[PDB]
């Protein structure tokens, strides 16, 4: 499954997921891309705020869905 994150630039990650890959493990992708920190992430789908250890298919998360990274 690709999915993309957009930060809080509108920067586009693109990443190759599995459906029960976890957030937490979507963090450490995100880590590895662009030097952010898991624990300053937080991820949004379509509204839903997103916990690290659901998986993608928890959150109907599908082939070329976009989250975001978010403020609290
Ligand atoms: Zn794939
Ligand atoms: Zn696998
Ligand atoms: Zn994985
Ligand atoms: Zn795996």
Known sequence: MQIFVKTLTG???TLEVEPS???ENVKAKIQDK???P???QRLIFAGK???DGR???DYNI???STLH???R
């Open 11 to 13: 920067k586009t990650i």
């Open 21 to 23: 890959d976890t957030i």
């Open 34 to 36: 662009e030097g952010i």
């Open 38 to 40: 898991p624990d300053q």
């Open 49 to 51: 705020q997103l916990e």
């Open 55 to 57: 998986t993608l298919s």
């Open 62 to 64: 599908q082939k070329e």
């Open 69 to 71: 990274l978010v403020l």
